[PDB]
Amino acid sequence: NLSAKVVQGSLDSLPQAVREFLENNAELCQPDHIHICDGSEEENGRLLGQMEEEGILRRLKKYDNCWLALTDPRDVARIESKTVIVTQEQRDTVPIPKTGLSQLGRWMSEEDFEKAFNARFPGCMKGRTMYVIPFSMGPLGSPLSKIGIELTDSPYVVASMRIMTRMGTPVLEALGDGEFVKCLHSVGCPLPLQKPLVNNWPCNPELTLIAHLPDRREIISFGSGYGGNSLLGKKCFALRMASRLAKEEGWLAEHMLVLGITNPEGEKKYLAAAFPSACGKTNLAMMNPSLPGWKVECVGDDIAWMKFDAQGHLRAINPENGFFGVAPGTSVKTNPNAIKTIQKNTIFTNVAETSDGGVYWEGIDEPLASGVTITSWKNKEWSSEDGEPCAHPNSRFCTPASQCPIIDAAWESPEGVPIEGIIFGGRRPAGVPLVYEALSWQHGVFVGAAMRSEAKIIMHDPFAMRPFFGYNFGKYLAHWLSMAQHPAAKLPKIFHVNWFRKDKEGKFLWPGFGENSRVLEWMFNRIDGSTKLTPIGYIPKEDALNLKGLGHINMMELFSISKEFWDKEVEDIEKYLVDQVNADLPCEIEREILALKQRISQM
Ligand SMILES: [Mn+2]
């Protein structure tokens, strides 16, 4: 029966639970074949070649083993509207807002979900192969890591998973008869194709739905092939589901990069930072610092799982195995370590391709040689005069973390790394100083809770988690607050930064990139215990910030704090938190709102 559709590996080789899971969805999705992924280079080579044949991937000959996927323009990014969490009670997923609709997540009834499921998955994989992906989120074999099993009908998803996680036979070895997260994905285009196929990229935008069923330890994704919607260990699992798990077990799951910074005296600290959309998450994570004698090393650029250790140190681990980085804006100047990481074994999605088989995108800042032309991401010849970018703004590179030249020696340490500083941020063209320090852990929690960022629209993005909350944000805030009561906790110092303050002409006041190291320097020394008090927190006092080697900086305007602006700021924050979190807003947050309001009143 089933055994006969297996084209790689052995049913009997799977632990019973894994097998039962496979049997159930195979019988449900009706795939022509079953491929049990082993994660070997050989298998990867096979899948890539096939992908080349079917025209799903193109080979980029300028580089060593680099590929390019072009998608249907209708499937290029996460769709928040189509992203849901399924629980018995709405309250458990999102707070009931005072007005309008929740901006803190999208909830769906068990009932509505069954209907939506039944309308999508039966026979969804016919004419296609169902791949079985065993994967570990976090270092392989660590008892603190979580294992998942993802069923997919997309070889692109497979090849990407091989990079973004530990994947294959060794993962199954470690799982044994242990529990796992059930992950079901399907591009939603059974053969024969009922609709036209674009760029050989199967997707079903109409019926696109990314679901999470925490009580069942299940993730169910339909209709999109885009990474955030299909790499189930990443957002769906390592952020959403995990934040819920963690909330139940004392730890934390955050949208945070993790970096290790060393001063000229050899002292080293690890910092974590939560930044929204652009904001240069990856640029900070693998920054080449401008300050002589300093050293920045990368642990992770997207996700952090943190748990207090026996001495009360917040330990962070990167459960990812690679970087799913935004490509436009990436250059030698802005992120030299990133350029180097991707010279090899990397999958690019939706970038442009030079005629010598290289890659290209806005802000690559790499002049073309005589006679090199550009094929844009829509497979058309391209010039600067066409009025559309050569690469999609959300285009991606998918690269092994082990290739980053400054990958931290402890990025896979099962013990994790001790966080001494948490950094919040956003793109605020006006009003918010370059860097400020929270006055207390409670105030710091409020700072993260107050996060806003210019997507020309400025939106709220609490802890940079707006699209990723796995449960009630009100409760998420309480959990964070409770940390100040954990026995002998060594709470990280909390800062808020802004690299995007503009002058009236809209020109940046701060150069950024390598120079942010200067800000990092200030944070580092503060952790070691100086400040100028302001209503919003501590800023660097005069001449404390290291400006040696910089052109001129308008420090006066960069750190300017206006009552007019901050009046409207706390006003907007209060309204947002009270309306959106409503009955679930922790009173400690209420106190910080009022306290900030008070402090602003005496200026
Ligand atoms: Mn992210």
UniProtKB/Swiss-Prot annotation:
Enumerate the InterPro entries for this protein.
PEP_carboxykin_GTP_CS (IPR018091), PEP_carboxykinase_C (IPR013035), PEP_carboxykinase_GTP (IPR008209), PEP_carboxykinase_GTP_C (IPR035077), PEP_carboxykinase_GTP_N (IPR035078), PEP_carboxykinase_N (IPR008210)
Pfam families given for it? PEPCK_GTP (PF00821), PEPCK_N (PF17297)
The gene name reads PCK1
What exactly does this protein do? Answer: Cytosolic phosphoenolpyruvate carboxykinase that catalyzes the reversible decarboxylation and phosphorylation of oxaloacetate (OAA) and acts as the rate-limiting enzyme in gluconeogenesis. Regulates cataplerosis and anaplerosis, the processes that control the levels of metabolic intermediates in the citric acid cycle. At low glucose levels, it catalyzes the cataplerotic conversion of oxaloacetate to phosphoenolpyruvate (PEP), the rate-limiting step in the metabolic pathway that produces glucose from lactate and other precursors derived from the citric acid cycle.
Q: In which pathway does it act?
A: Carbohydrate biosynthesis; gluconeogenesis
Which residues does the annotation say bind GTP? 278-283, 396, 427, 513-516
Which compartments does it reside in? Answer: Cytoplasm, Cytosol; Endoplasmic reticulum
Q: How is its activity regulated?
A: Phosphoenolpyruvate carboxykinase activity is regulated by acetylation and glucose levels. The anaplerotic conversion of phosphoenolpyruvate to oxaloacetate is improved by PCK1 acetylation on Lys-82 (K91ac), Lys-456 (K473ac) and Lys-504 (K521ac). High glucose concentrations favor PCK1 anaplerotic activity by triggering acetylation on Lys-82 (K91ac). At low glucose levels, SIRT1-mediated deacetylation of Lys-82 promotes the cataplerotic conversion of oxaloacetate to phosphoenolpyruvate.
Paste the cofactor note: Binds 1 Mn(2+) ion per subunit.
| Family listed | Belongs to the phosphoenolpyruvate carboxykinase [GTP] family.
Tell me what organism the protein belongs to.
Homo sapiens
- Amino acids binding substrate: 78, 226-228, 277, 394-396
Q: What induces it?
A: Regulated by cAMP and insulin.
Q: Name one GO molecular function term.
A: phosphoenolpyruvate carboxykinase (GTP) activity
Residues bearing the modification Phosphoserine: 10, 81, 109, 277
Which residue ranges does the record annotate as region Omega-loop?
448-470
Q: What is the protein's major site of localization?
A: cytoplasm
Annotated Gene Ontology cellular component terms: cytoplasm; cytosol; endoplasmic reticulum; extracellular exosome; mitochondrion
- Origin superkingdom: Eukaryota
Protein name as catalogued: Phosphoenolpyruvate carboxykinase, cytosolic [GTP]
What is the reported tissue distribution? Major sites of expression are liver, kidney and adipocytes.
Q: What is the lineage of its organism?
A: Eukaryota, Metazoa, Chordata, Craniata, Vertebrata
UniProt PTM: Acetylated. Lysine acetylation by p300/EP300 is increased on high glucose conditions. Lysine acetylation promotes ubiquitination by UBR5. Acetylation is enhanced in the presence of BAG6. Deacetylated by SIRT2. Deacetylation of Lys-82 is carried out by SIRT1 and depends on PCK1 phosphorylation levels.
| Residues modified to N6-acetyllysine | 61-62, 82, 456, 504, 507, 575
Q: Name one GO biological process term.
A: peptidyl-serine phosphorylation
**Disease implicated:** Phosphoenolpyruvate carboxykinase deficiency, cytosolic: An autosomal recessive metabolic disorder characterized by impaired gluconeogenesis, hypoglycemia, hypotonia, hepatomegaly, hepatic dysfunction, failure to thrive, lactic acidosis, and elevated tricarboxylic acid intermediates, particularly fumarate, in urine.
Report residues binding Mn(2+): 235, 255, 302
